Amino acid sequence: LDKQQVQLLAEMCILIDENDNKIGAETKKNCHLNENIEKGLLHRAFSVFLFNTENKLLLQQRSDAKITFPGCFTNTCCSHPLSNPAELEESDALGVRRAAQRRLKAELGIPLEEVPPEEINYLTRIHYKAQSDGIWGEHEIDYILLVRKNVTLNPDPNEIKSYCYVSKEELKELLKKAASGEIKITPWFKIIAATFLFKWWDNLNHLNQFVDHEKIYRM
């Protein structure tokens, strides 16, 4: 496996129960092993959907170095808060927003100053489980975050092998090519595009009717 990505496997994730209450901490490696997921290990995560002024969504294609879903197209950023004081903060989901700011800089090279927590809109949470291969997989309650800004980019090639802003029609053609096997997409992107994505995209200026901090949608 890629050395840089192997080093990130030692990061401490936040373990949660099924209602997103923190119950412990565990390494990223252990949180993504199917053998631990099969026993119910679950951690907190987030997914960013970043739109620019032209109302295009910023997608990334994961690098081939990623241990789970390498080379797959997905939304702007999908990662997780760490088990440290700053990112465990539950007030107004500030820990998750701080982690999103941190990873947007680490993966896409977006300056910390362009995406401070006050620019990151927490919409709702989705619970899902998937397998990448026989060894690795995912099991998380994902905080869906939305950003609307014309950021600057300087991505880390270790993280992504490409990025692109897409209009709604372009995302639709992308999804068609994924159905043909032409390209691959991640499960969390597939789930969200099939459920809430186009709904939020049509109301970027009035996301209020779409905010739900109470329910955890079980996908």
Ligand SMILES: [Mg+2]
């Ligand atoms: Mg995860």
